[PDB]
Design a protein around this ligand. Structure first.
Ligand code: ADP
Ligand code: ADP
Ligand code: ADP
Ligand code: MG
Ligand code: MG
Ligand code: MG
Lengths: 165, 128, 359, 165, 359, 153, 359
């Protein structure tokens, strides 16, 4: 336990992103499909990465593949927390679940990896109600669209984000 | 309360007991369709036994004149008994139709009040 | 000494003439594997064997199975040789004449009984109450019978049979006890529920009023201890289970209640005798032993009865075994020894002798 | 299944002890109230104990309590088969039933305990018509007059051998 | 948009009206330490906590845990606020009226749902098959129900409840898989056995002939890969596990099989309607998804039924979620917007409005 | 219950058919949901006049992939007497789509209960169940019926 | 004379009928190079070879090594020819029927035994205590079994198997002895730790109080002498090692303790026989030989069973070999010689004769 606390701006983002309240169609487009969390400059709080977010409106018009675009947002030399709203489909149902991605590449400095890993359980206990978690330590572990499918359902998942696997 | 060691006997499970207004008589009714009156003055001995009910008696009341009492039973019949003469009685057949009289009381020596499970209260003028 | 056997739809009551109570009371079941277990032996084996009732509604259906119950009765229950004691048997109302000839045949050939007699169950209960004319509501285990009797002669045209009885009440209590989370499914657990029914169930005078007051009643809740030490708690099911006697819709049945079945059979008689039947309604059978069932029956029948008519429901304290006790008293009388169907008379006349001596 | 057979003397005694046939009053007193069985010296048959029996005539004249003296006949270092003709009374009936008692104290030698327990199923199946069985493994389990009442009817038994519980 | 929630005995199926399949299917369990984890969280939390079913046999016994499951359903599974969407709920056959009102009260007072509706699971399965009269054999996780329905009205006197279902089959497969040397004991390993049951198990038309086939060859053997990569083989256990449905004696149970329970409930109805029930036997539930179960049910019922009668077993391909699919189709109809129970109607007639609006 | 409203023309048509000019009396008639699926309308060109095998030309009128309601004025002659009673037919083929089967089944009591006095209902879930002339006879009078539609059974 | 062979999960007991003790007691292992060494010879090579158990949890997994163990039993341990003496074999509860036929086929074809018999281990332990009805908690080397037996017939649906046994206790003691600085890792040092377990370990009545007692005094410490002369001291590990029986969480297992497994299997039986099982709990096996285990078992089951129930744990002083002693007495009876399966009987019927003669 490093002691890093989750900021109120991250908890509010998670609450809005988790429960989908009835809203106007122009307000549905402002929902977040993916969002990145980082550490503050003093490394005391987990804050939001400004500009590192994917809106639902962008998906399908600007963002053709939400997962491919989200992966490119991950830094290549730094650790990051992520919240991806995966829309998949199994052989029996169509599901829409939140995924907690812990990005920690081997290329990241050792200082960042220790702080992010030690405080990972502290942030995830505040983000109550999330079941799927992806721990990625390499680009290949997160670039592949399949690796999410095994985490989501396994072999049951037949489609992901509207595209067959 | 001290148990006096006195056991008055009825003809069945006691359903209601009522002392007279002057305390000179105790009337006991049971499930054996019998009303037994005990004379308090003479060693709590049996005074009279009243017959005529054909179902379990559920209620009993003493008239203010201390000479008459009325009992209602599950036979849907109310009898007003003369204490002196057990052979004379007033048969109020179906005071409340299809319902037995759950409770009864006397407004005075000539007015009898009966209630039942039909949620109604009735007054009867009793003439001897 | 003579033997008295009361063949019931769910229980067989047997004993010796002159006794106050039957010596043996065992279930009238014959079990066979899913070699042959009869009586309480079948109950002690449960799932290994299949249970069947030869007498299910008062009338014998499997004469092969009822022979084994009779053999179990004489040797295992009464522990006497049937060939040494005369046997008094009881038959259900509206018993077919073919069954009467079969019953008298089995006793004399299979069991070699010296003397035999067959009596109507309904008239034995009425006689035991000191009555000769009246209507007897015999609510047993598998069948409920309303038998109007006029000077000792049961009126066959007015006898009504209702299949709602104690067996259905046990299943109803079994079903509504699962609403509290208790699991009563196996055969052994069914006799446990029957014990709860016979100890904690009662008939309410007004079901709607009882349901309202029992919500905040501190005395309604009762606790029952299972044979393995577990404690189950029963609440408003105490008066809900026997309410199906008067409201068969609780079981999904469309039939009338016991109060209406009793009223229907009275209305099937002559207007001359209906006055005596209303004033001599005698309750008999195990299912009529609920506390408060006589008061409820009087209230319900009075509603159906004409405006000016005396309704008297008779519930003697010994009505559970009134059929057997009446038979035991009758068989023990010295003056009754001439009314036995002797073995010699059987050979001369055959099975038809029962239609003349036993009437 | 030790293969130990039941002697014809035991079966004859059981048949007489089960079914009560009409007899003279001097013959009723010769009925057996409780009888003890044991293994032969060659351990091949279940023979009948010579003097370990109680007659009905002795009950009420010499034997005040038939069950109390019956327990005194059971050896405290050997296993036995017993047949007790209990006459109890419930709240609804006065019953008279046969009870099969398998006495097997813990102080008995293991050879006796093994053969008696293994051969019990053979003798019990030959004694057809018996419903109650009391399995006693210590004096405390059989000395108490109550332990018969629970086995006989349970809590419904109010009298045992003519005396209240 | 309206919500359709199917409160199963072991699995809760929830989704949105108009969708082809439920969005969320999670276990109906509430786990507490040996603070409180509901659903898949209790499964994925090690064997450090006790698991409890608020619904275990179709009837809600613990109403405090039921609210936890419903709260988990709307917020964690459906990810919606119940105060903004009407909810359609399904109830088991023979559901007590008090439980029906309690479900209505919780939705309007604890969750503040704008509108609410209750439907019977059995009638939703029958309607989805294009039928109004027939018998539905709904075999789920913790309970099996045979509900004879005639002209849209279920017959309560003939509904039979069977405790044998998929939960007992999963435990049976665990027991018989240890014969091959595969130790499945933990909660995590129980979910693996359930996957084996749902992928490799089938019902054999002739059990005794199939057992000889398995013992004389290896064509019936199949391989299953465990989550950690180990491959296990399963032979005659493929058809032995679902055989307990037709032979409950494999589990040590007293009750009859699903084929005999269906036959017993049909024979508990009127003779005029038995012909229509025999030809309209509809299968529903997860436990009815074994391949070859309709052929086995057809053959077994034909043996019990009279030869003159025609037996037809209906096994629609969507029968696994036929209750939910019917509710989703019904709740999405433009004409159903007037069939809801509003909040305004609730706080004018109380929980008793569910008996008038619905049912 | 789906909540659809039965059209008032259905009740009048049943009322005219229930009571008994002849050349204009209907022998069969089909009912269907409207295009918006909120009314049990009467099909315009799917009916049989009395003046016009009447049962054969009615069965072939049923669609092969959609559910329908029907009202047949079946005539039969039993041994004791000859009688004619209306039969309500709920045609719901298995090949019909899932939504069509559910809406028709859940709204069948809406129309059947509005036609009070009907005593016979035939639930045909396949063509073999409606073409079968024996089952219709059994529904009408069972073993009592000997001839149906004027022809021996 | 006749041979009695009690092939256990970790130890093989063999001897002659009529003897008070088994002549040969050797480990049931077969060693192969990392040609083939069986029993004590395999233990004498340690890490040179690899050790495998043909019987590991009661049932035989590899029948090829079992034949070598039986061959070692007759010629090397018993020093007799199996072709001249009938052999009585014991089988674990819930043994597959196929294994029973394989066992008798090997005896008659491979070893040419003149006669053979197969007996259940649980019923032999119960009979040796002078009981026909009860529950036997057989805790051995590789597996723990709770077998409820009624009237000499084990109830298969209620038999519970727990993989925690003496083998897991030896490994746990090895693990916790290293906390004091004693390195016990090799095969040779494992047998030393087994000796420490069998001489210095005991079950504490109150584990938490006893744990605090050891932390404040040296009264619980004991000294043990290693084979080569060093003396090691053991303190609170004396009662920690067998505490894993009642708290399997010490070993990382999610299963319940032996007290809960016994209670769970009793509650899986019929309610009318649970009272008899509570007062007839018999302990058998080597893992039940710890001092103070009967007192701890009684206390733990009392807290689980209803307060009205009477709990009696039977721990005979000879329970370590009660299975073999019961078999030796049974086979030595002169009236048992007709219960053997003769070679002539085997030829006529085949391996299936065991299911009838041995039941
Ligand atoms: N004391 C009781 N109170 C309420 N119900 C009882 C009581 N005793 C028996 N019953 C029921 O009465 C039934 C058996 O009574 P019985 O008169 O012998 O019927 P039958 O002779 O037809 O077998 C049983 O179902 C039993 O449960
Ligand atoms: N495809 C399948 N094949 C065989 N069995 C299945 C299959 N799917 C589910 N089952 C069983 O069906 C059970 C749950 O199904 P369900 O009908 O939803 O029951 P419930 O209504 O009680 O929730 C589970 O125990 C599952 O194991
Ligand atoms: N005297 C003892 N005290 C405590 N544990 C013992 C004792 N004797 C043996 N054990 C353990 O019991 C195990 C073997 O006992 P056993 O009953 O023969 O099992 P199995 O049936 O598998 O042969 C061994 O692991 C041994 O360590
Ligand atoms: Mg009777
Ligand atoms: Mg379901
Ligand atoms: Mg062993």
């Amino acid at each position: 336990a490093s002691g890093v606390a989750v900021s109120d701006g991250v908890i509010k983002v998670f609450n809005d992103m988790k429960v989908r309240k009835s809203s106007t169609p122009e307000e549905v487009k402002k929902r977040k499909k993916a969002v990145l969390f980082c550490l503050s400059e003093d490394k005391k709080n987990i804050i939001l990465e400004e500009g590192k977010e994917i809106l639902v409106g962008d998906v399908g018009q600007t963002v053709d593949d939400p997962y491919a675009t989200f992966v490119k947002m991950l830094p290549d030399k730094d650790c990051r927390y992520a919240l991806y709203d995966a829309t998949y489909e199994t052989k029996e149902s169509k599901k829409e679940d939140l995924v907690f991605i812990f990005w920690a590449p081997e290329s990241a400095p050792l200082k960042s990896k220790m702080i992010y890993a030690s405080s990972k359980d502290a942030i995830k206990k505040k983000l109550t109600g999330i079941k799927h978690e992806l721990q990625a330590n390499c680009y290949e572990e997160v670039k592949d669209r399949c690796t999410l499918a095994e985490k989501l359902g396994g072999s049951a998942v037949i489609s992901l984000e509207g595209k067959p696997l | 309360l001290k148990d006096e060691g006195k056991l008055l006997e009825a003809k069945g499970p006691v359903t209601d007991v009522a002392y007279s207004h002057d305390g000179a008589f105790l009337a006991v009714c049971d499930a054996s369709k019998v009303v037994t009156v005990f004379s308090v003055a003479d060693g709590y001995s049996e005074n009279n036994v009243f017959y005529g009910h054909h179902a379990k008696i559920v209620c009993l009341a003493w008239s203010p004149d201390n000479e008459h009492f009325a009992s209602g039973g599950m036979d849907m019949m109310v009898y007003v008994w003369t204490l002196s003469d057990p052979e004379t009685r007033v048969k109020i057949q179906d005071a409340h139709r299809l319902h037995h009289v759950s409770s009864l009381a006397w407004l005075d020596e000539h007015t009898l009040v009966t209630t039942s499970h039909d949620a109604s209260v009735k007054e009867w003028t009793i003439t001897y | 000494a003579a033997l008295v056997v009361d063949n019931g739809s769910g229980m067989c009551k047997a004993g010796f003439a002159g006794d106050d109570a039957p010596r043996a009371v065992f279930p009238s079941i014959v079990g066979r594997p899913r070699d042959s277990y009869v009586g309480d032996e079948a109950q002690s084996k449960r799932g290994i064997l299949t249970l069947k009732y030869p007498i299910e509604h008062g009338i014998v259906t499997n004469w092969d199975d009822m022979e084994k119950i009779w053999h179990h009765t004489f040797y295992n229950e009464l522990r006497v040789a049937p060939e040494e004691h005369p046997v008094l048997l009881t038959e259900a109302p509206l018993n077919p004449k073919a069954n009467r000839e079969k019953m008298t045949q089995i006793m004399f050939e299979t069991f070699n009984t010296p003397a035999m007699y067959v009596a109507i169950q309904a008239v034995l209960s009425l006689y035991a109450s000191g009555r000769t004319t009246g209507i007897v509501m015999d609510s047993g285990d598998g069948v409920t019978h309303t038998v109007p009797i006029y000077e000792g002669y049961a009126l066959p045209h007015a006898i009504l049979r209702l299949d709602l009885a104690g067996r259905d009440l046990t299943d109803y209590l079994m079903k509504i006890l699962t609403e509290r989370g208790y699991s009563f499914t196996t055969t052994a657990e069914r006799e446990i529920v029957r014990d709860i029914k016979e100890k904690l169930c009662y008939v309410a005078l007004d079901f709607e009023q009882e349901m309202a007051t029992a919500a905040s009643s501190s005395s309604l809740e009762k606790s029952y201890e299972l044979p393995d030490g577990q404690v189950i708690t029963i609440g408003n099911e105490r008066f809900r289970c026997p309410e199906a006697l008067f409201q068969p819709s609780f079981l999904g049945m469309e039939s009338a209640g016991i109060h209406e079945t009793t009223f229907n059979s009275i209305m099937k008689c002559d207007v001359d005798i209906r006055k005596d039947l209303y004033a001599n309604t005698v309750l008999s059978g195990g299912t009529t032993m609920y506390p408060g069932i006589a008061d409820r029956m009087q209230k319900e029948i009075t509603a159906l009865a004409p405006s000016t008519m005396k309704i008297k429901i008779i519930a003697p304290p010994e009505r559970k075994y009134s059929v057997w006790i009446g038979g035991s008293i009758l068989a023990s009388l010295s003056t009754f020894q001439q009314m036995w169907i002797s073995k010699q008379e059987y050979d001369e006349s055959g099975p038809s002798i029962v239609h003349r001596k036993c009437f």
